Design an enzyme around this catalytic site. Structure first.
Site, PDB file in Angstrom:
ATOM      1  CE1 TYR A 185      33.616 -42.576 -23.215  1.00 29.51           C
ATOM      2  CE2 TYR A 185      35.667 -41.416 -23.679  1.00 29.51           C
ATOM      3  CZ  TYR A 185      34.720 -42.363 -24.014  1.00 29.51           C
ATOM      4  OH  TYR A 185      34.895 -43.091 -25.159  1.00 29.51           O
TER       5      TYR A 185
ATOM      6  CE  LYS B 187      37.195 -44.961 -27.466  1.00 30.36           C
ATOM      7  NZ  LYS B 187      37.082 -45.914 -28.588  1.00 30.36           N
TER       8      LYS B 187
HETATM    9  N1  LIG Z   1      28.299 -45.588 -28.415  1.00 28.12           N
HETATM   10  C1  LIG Z   1      28.828 -44.394 -28.677  1.00 28.12           C
HETATM   11  O1  LIG Z   1      28.145 -43.389 -28.767  1.00 28.12           O
HETATM   12  C2  LIG Z   1      30.318 -44.207 -28.933  1.00 28.12           C
HETATM   13  C3  LIG Z   1      30.746 -42.927 -29.306  1.00 28.12           C
HETATM   14  C4  LIG Z   1      31.965 -42.738 -29.960  1.00 28.12           C
HETATM   15  C5  LIG Z   1      32.774 -43.834 -30.246  1.00 28.12           C
HETATM   16  N2  LIG Z   1      32.370 -45.112 -29.827  1.00 28.12           N
HETATM   17  C6  LIG Z   1      33.340 -46.207 -29.948  1.00 28.12           C
HETATM   18  O2  LIG Z   1      32.988 -47.112 -30.980  1.00 28.12           O
HETATM   19  C7  LIG Z   1      33.371 -48.421 -30.558  1.00 28.12           C
HETATM   20  C8  LIG Z   1      32.192 -49.339 -30.759  1.00 28.12           C
HETATM   21  O3  LIG Z   1      31.468 -49.483 -29.538  1.00 28.12           O
HETATM   22  P1  LIG Z   1      29.909 -49.718 -29.674  1.00 28.12           P
HETATM   23  O4  LIG Z   1      29.265 -48.552 -29.075  1.00 28.12           O
HETATM   24  O5  LIG Z   1      29.643 -50.062 -31.076  1.00 28.12           O
HETATM   25  O6  LIG Z   1      29.392 -50.786 -28.638  1.00 28.12           O
HETATM   26  P2  LIG Z   1      29.399 -52.363 -28.681  1.00 28.12           P
HETATM   27  O7  LIG Z   1      29.013 -52.835 -27.320  1.00 28.12           O
HETATM   28  O8  LIG Z   1      28.650 -52.755 -29.889  1.00 28.12           O
HETATM   29  O9  LIG Z   1      30.907 -52.640 -29.173  1.00 28.12           O
HETATM   30  C9  LIG Z   1      32.112 -52.643 -28.360  1.00 28.12           C
HETATM   31  C10 LIG Z   1      32.876 -53.845 -28.916  1.00 28.12           C
HETATM   32  O10 LIG Z   1      34.186 -54.110 -28.363  1.00 28.12           O
HETATM   33  C11 LIG Z   1      34.208 -55.530 -28.230  1.00 28.12           C
HETATM   34  N3  LIG Z   1      35.268 -56.003 -27.336  1.00 28.12           N
HETATM   35  C12 LIG Z   1      35.544 -55.535 -26.109  1.00 28.12           C
HETATM   36  N4  LIG Z   1      36.591 -56.196 -25.604  1.00 28.12           N
HETATM   37  C13 LIG Z   1      36.935 -57.101 -26.528  1.00 28.12           C
HETATM   38  C14 LIG Z   1      38.147 -57.819 -26.551  1.00 28.12           C
HETATM   39  N5  LIG Z   1      38.838 -58.110 -25.453  1.00 28.12           N
HETATM   40  N6  LIG Z   1      38.490 -58.331 -27.752  1.00 28.12           N
HETATM   41  C15 LIG Z   1      37.683 -58.242 -28.829  1.00 28.12           C
HETATM   42  N7  LIG Z   1      36.498 -57.618 -28.780  1.00 28.12           N
HETATM   43  C16 LIG Z   1      36.120 -56.981 -27.640  1.00 28.12           C
HETATM   44  C17 LIG Z   1      32.835 -55.830 -27.671  1.00 28.12           C
HETATM   45  O11 LIG Z   1      32.392 -57.170 -27.895  1.00 28.12           O
HETATM   46  C18 LIG Z   1      31.965 -55.023 -28.614  1.00 28.12           C
HETATM   47  O12 LIG Z   1      31.443 -55.710 -29.769  1.00 28.12           O
HETATM   48  C19 LIG Z   1      33.856 -48.300 -29.129  1.00 28.12           C
HETATM   49  O13 LIG Z   1      35.277 -48.251 -29.136  1.00 28.12           O
HETATM   50  C20 LIG Z   1      33.345 -46.977 -28.692  1.00 28.12           C
HETATM   51  O14 LIG Z   1      34.208 -46.326 -27.779  1.00 28.12           O
HETATM   52  C21 LIG Z   1      31.142 -45.302 -29.165  1.00 28.12           C
HETATM   53  C1  LIG Z   2      32.627 -49.499 -18.977  1.00 31.54           C
HETATM   54  C2  LIG Z   2      32.666 -49.226 -20.455  1.00 31.54           C
HETATM   55  C3  LIG Z   2      32.470 -50.254 -21.376  1.00 31.54           C
HETATM   56  C4  LIG Z   2      32.447 -49.965 -22.728  1.00 31.54           C
HETATM   57  C5  LIG Z   2      32.630 -48.667 -23.122  1.00 31.54           C
HETATM   58  C6  LIG Z   2      32.617 -48.348 -24.593  1.00 31.54           C
HETATM   59  N1  LIG Z   2      32.399 -46.945 -24.789  1.00 31.54           N
HETATM   60  C7  LIG Z   2      33.299 -46.075 -25.206  1.00 31.54           C
HETATM   61  N2  LIG Z   2      32.732 -44.915 -25.328  1.00 31.54           N
HETATM   62  C8  LIG Z   2      31.447 -45.071 -24.982  1.00 31.54           C
HETATM   63  C9  LIG Z   2      30.420 -44.083 -24.976  1.00 31.54           C
HETATM   64  C10 LIG Z   2      30.574 -42.763 -25.377  1.00 31.54           C
HETATM   65  C11 LIG Z   2      29.365 -42.041 -25.276  1.00 31.54           C
HETATM   66  C12 LIG Z   2      28.364 -42.781 -24.747  1.00 31.54           C
HETATM   67  S1  LIG Z   2      28.813 -44.413 -24.433  1.00 31.54           S
HETATM   68  C13 LIG Z   2      31.223 -46.379 -24.632  1.00 31.54           C
HETATM   69  C14 LIG Z   2      32.838 -47.646 -22.220  1.00 31.54           C
HETATM   70  C15 LIG Z   2      32.854 -47.920 -20.873  1.00 31.54           C
END
Ligand SMILES: NC(=O)c1ccc[n+]([C@@H]2O[C@H](COP(=O)([O-])OP(=O)(O)OC[C@H]3O[C@@H](n4cnc5c(N)ncnc54)[C@H](O)[C@@H]3O)[C@@H](O)[C@H]2O)c1
Ligand SMILES: Cc1ccc(Cn2cnc(-c3cccs3)c2)cc1
Ligand SMILES: NC(=O)c1ccc[n+]([C@@H]2O[C@H](COP(=O)([O-])OP(=O)(O)OC[C@H]3O[C@@H](n4cnc5c(N)ncnc54)[C@H](O)[C@@H]3O)[C@@H](O)[C@H]2O)c1
Ligand SMILES: NC(=O)c1ccc[n+]([C@@H]2O[C@H](COP(=O)([O-])OP(=O)(O)OC[C@H]3O[C@@H](n4cnc5c(N)ncnc54)[C@H](O)[C@@H]3O)[C@@H](O)[C@H]2O)c1
Ligand SMILES: NC(=O)c1ccc[n+]([C@@H]2O[C@H](COP(=O)([O-])OP(=O)(O)OC[C@H]3O[C@@H](n4cnc5c(N)ncnc54)[C@H](O)[C@@H]3O)[C@@H](O)[C@H]2O)c1
Ligand SMILES: Cc1ccc(Cn2cnc(-c3cccs3)c2)cc1
Ligand SMILES: Cc1ccc(Cn2cnc(-c3cccs3)c2)cc1
Ligand SMILES: Cc1ccc(Cn2cnc(-c3cccs3)c2)cc1
Lengths: 257, 257, 257, 257
Positions: free
Chosen positions: D155, D162
């Site tokens: 991470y 975060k």
């Molecule tokens: N996937 C997981 O398990 C996980 C776990 C905990 C929290 N989250 C958080 O929830 C959030 C949602 O991510 P996600 O997993 O839904 O994936 P995702 O790929 O759907 O969403 C990430 C979003 O950020 C947007 N983004 C990035 N840079 C941008 C910018 N410059 N301006 C505007 N938009 C932009 C991307 O287009 C995308 O829609 C993330 O912050 C992620 O860290 C994800």
């Molecule tokens: C390189 C990169 C691009 C986009 C993300 C968004 N992101 C934040 N947290 C996560 C995840 C947490 C657990 C599994 S994926 C993904 C993280 C890394």
């Protein structure tokens, strides 16, 4: 003392009020061999004076905002300390406008960038640059503040920079642990140092804290120095990735109104 | 050493594997004058032997389950140490049935009562009884485990007893701070001591921890002893109400699978 | 509503001010079928009245101090609700003498015993007693206070009881999770109920909080009621073992004057 | 629904797997009027499609890296929504090289910069830009990960971003609270979205969690969607500055094998 045989690098000394000053003294008291760094020309001779009081003559320039500065500093240190046992990172910064009033209205993209880069990235940046030079059994120490855990009026973006810093303590502790390196932080209580000016209603804060702090007194750099000496000695080999609160219990009590 | 001039009371010594043993040694190393207590007849002579190895001859009986025992112990100590500088509380108990399997099915009202009384109440009970005899600058130390913060399989009600204990650290730190007394806890990592038997899959646990712990090794009572020596010395005057994790960073990392 | 088709057992309704009352109203509004218990005869009729208003005629007695009392109440409940979906534990207790003044001088062995048995164990006691009557997808809820995490004046031993209860939540949650049961707690901000009288200078405290709470107001049982209804509905399926703070942000801020 | 009469801005919808998608579905189900933004043209049409399905034709572009982009998007939104009730910040980013391997060797100054700007600052940037358009009773929501609190392999710098974002939540909450605005975050368990590919051995991690998570299953965007809808409705009025974990209990347990 309990630091005898340790060669430690202390950053952040700006004056006798500096937290890094209290730490340096204490470390020197317990027998560590110190090396120092100064940010600019303004501070050079001062640090050089203090270094000499502490039997040290390794005073190098370092502006954590320049990767090249860091690299060059560690190159000069190597010439005399090919391998050392860690360093104290007592640096922190945020532009003036940042720590005054309503956080949302005060914060700006560039202040946020500077606050984090100097206050949080710099820590890993330095470890990054001396990784190879570290002896196993090495300890890296950093200073944080309660503002990372709670929302403190006027602390503003620095809270976020500190939060970032504390997380940096954990990730660095996890990655370096396997090679003999521990990484910790001291979350110190407010102390009257050069950093006091910049913050709104300081002297008022220091009075409130003393009245509501379990030990009924604000901590001193002596206090901090001793905890730092310990955290950089083998006496704490079992502690790594830890943010030790040296605030007289201020953080654990509530409504001591 | 850094404890020279301190008269500290160490409870909980049962064997050379005991955490209180490692602490006693370390405290003795840094120059503190120790006094000991033993739970019963079974342990008396053992403790008496160790006390003598540590230059001490103040070995009193004390069963923290009896208010009268505590009182009487502190009365005998007074005869020789009218005033002392704190004590280490390395006691803990829970009936056998309690720490085996499904917590909900294992826990019972009486086990819950015993686990808390011995593991958490006893701490304050002892402070209560010697409050008056404490010198300002005094430090009280206690040992806890990660089980208070997280749910650890088989730890069961002890987790709750420890949670209760840690909160006890805070309240006692807040109430005693005003008179020169600090109160802290060390949340140690698992160590192979007499307490190991009682817990399911121990030797397995100790292998998992070593592989996933930042420092890549489980802590030793030496480690704990040094952190305890520090927490009971003036070197830590700025720390009170704190639960210092001496677990090699185990708690701050995640999925180090 | 989001609780349509849920049969929830609500404990602790003592008055219209009671946090258990607000939670009952809320879950009732959301479409849950309720059942209530009362501690003794002094509250029999009242609780029967409130239940009536909430369209329920399941008003069983229960004194959590008696495993026998609990066992029999779940016996009666079974007759009508062979299977149910969870319960709200809104019970707390500590003898008067325990709650005022210096904790170290106020706390006594029996007080500590009574405090933890009624305030912490009872939660699991009840879980133990109906574990087999619970439907998959059930949720258990309890109410804690920031006193568990911080040292608040006069909360004294109740702080330890809640710390112990909060850890009860994590153990119970980890134990019952694999069978479809979630266990959570709500750490509520101070509210004016029957707990008001018995705590030193409540009025001053409720005025301080309002001043310093981010939302600039103390929470209401309505507020808590809604977080409660949500934590016991399938909307919070992904949440278990959590202590959700419903304190208007009070605990996250620091030195807000 | 519990969101009837709320106009909420949903950021980050990239695919049907996106956490922003699940949250949008949920709030839509609950009766909220939605507005969406898309990062660039590659996602213009798609997001326009999803919005359509959710009965919304407010699909504005926004690249949180440009204060100018944000300012203009809130300009367009104003034309139709002069006053609204909050927004969902579901954005995160860090250059590929930052996320794999030894954090200390992977992290670089620019990476750290980009990670914190996009993942942490943007949240406040947006608050800054619409602060005056927000109705009293509004709620802002963001998604964090346990990586902020613990050190998870790979991470890396995202852990610091975060940590910084979570502290952003407490500062923003304390700042905006007095004007009727609540700010909260959801610390979600791993989910299979576009973030899946870019993180080392995700599949192994999602199998480990399921095994060790109290509810014995990873959470779904539906699960998160419902906690999200609840955190942006008046049902959570008493909650601000909080990081609600929606991880099936994963973080509260330890050593569950
Ligand atoms: N996937 C997981 O398990 C996980 C776990 C905990 C929290 N989250 C958080 O929830 C959030 C949602 O991510 P996600 O997993 O839904 O994936 P995702 O790929 O759907 O969403 C990430 C979003 O950020 C947007 N983004 C990035 N840079 C941008 C910018 N410059 N301006 C505007 N938009 C932009 C991307 O287009 C995308 O829609 C993330 O912050 C992620 O860290 C994800
Ligand atoms: C390189 C990169 C691009 C986009 C993300 C968004 N992101 C934040 N947290 C996560 C995840 C947490 C657990 C599994 S994926 C993904 C993280 C890394
Ligand atoms: N004194 C307090 O009340 C207090 C309390 C808690 C935490 N802290 C923390 O302790 C640390 C030291 O603060 P202090 O009060 O002793 O401050 P100080 O003002 O005496 O010194 C701060 C140091 O930061 C250094 N610095 C800033 N930018 C630098 C850069 N670009 N490169 C190299 N050095 C740079 C300065 O040279 C300076 O010596 C900081 O991390 C601070 O947040 C201070
Ligand atoms: N060793 C570990 O792995 C470990 C790890 C973390 C925390 N701890 C904690 O450290 C402490 C010491 O444990 P240890 O492993 O050194 O154990 P140990 O078994 O060597 O000794 C425990 C001590 O508890 C004492 N005790 C029990 N009931 C007593 C009572 N009624 N009155 C007086 N004394 C009583 C016993 O006499 C004994 O000496 C406990 O609080 C324990 O929870 C141990
Ligand atoms: N009032 C607050 O601000 C505050 C704050 C945070 C959490 N809480 C907690 O919420 C819970 C609800 O308390 P309340 O404020 O609603 O007050 P209350 O007086 O309405 O409720 C306390 C309940 O516990 C019941 N009870 C006590 N002992 C009993 C026993 N032996 N067996 C069965 N029932 C018994 C009492 O009858 C009563 O109904 C308490 O645990 C309290 O700690 C209260
Ligand atoms: C402008 C500036 C100079 C120095 C600092 C260092 N610093 C960090 N935190 C603090 C403070 C902690 C308590 C009160 S001020 C100071 C921060 C900002
Ligand atoms: C039966 C019993 C004897 C001794 C103890 C002391 N103790 C407390 N916690 C522990 C443990 C921590 C880690 C593994 S066992 C031991 C607890 C129970
Ligand atoms: C003596 C006593 C009886 C009943 C209680 C219940 N209680 C628990 N917490 C509280 C309160 C927290 C904040 C204000 S009142 C009350 C507490 C003490």
């Amino acid at each position: 003392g309990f630091l005898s045989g340790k060669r430690i690098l202390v950053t952040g000394v700006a004056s006798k009020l500096s937290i890094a000053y209290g730490i340096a003294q204490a470390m020197h008291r317990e027998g560590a061999e110190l090396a120092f760094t100064y940010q600019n020309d303004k501070l050079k001779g001062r640090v050089e004076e203090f270094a000499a009081q502490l039997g040290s003559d390794i005073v190098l320039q370092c502006d954590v905002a320049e990767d090249a500065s860091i690299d060059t500093m560690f190159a000069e240190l190597g010439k005399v300390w090919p391998k050392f046992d860690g360093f104290v990172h007592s640096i922190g910064f945020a532009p003036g406008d940042q720590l005054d009033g309503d956080y949302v209205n005060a914060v700006t993209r560039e202040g946020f960038k500077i606050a984090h880069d100097i206050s949080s990235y710099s820590f890993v940046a330095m470890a990054k640059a001396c990784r190879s030079m570290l002896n196993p059994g090495s300890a890296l120490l950093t200073l944080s503040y309660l503002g990372a855990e709670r929302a403190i009026p006027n602390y503003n973006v620095m809270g976020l920079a500190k939060a970032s810093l504390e997380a940096n303590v954990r990730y660095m502790a996890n990655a370096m642990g396997p090679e003999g390196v521990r990484v910790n932080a001291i979350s110190a209580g407010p102390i009257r140092t050069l950093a006091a000016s910049g913050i709104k209603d300081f002297r008022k804060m220091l009075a409130h804290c003393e009245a509501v702090t379990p030990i009924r007194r604000t901590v001193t750099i002596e206090d901090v120095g001793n905890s730092a000496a310990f955290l950089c000695s083998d006496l704490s080999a079992g502690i790594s990735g830890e943010v030790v609160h040296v605030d007289g219990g201020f953080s654990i009590a509530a409504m001591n109104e």
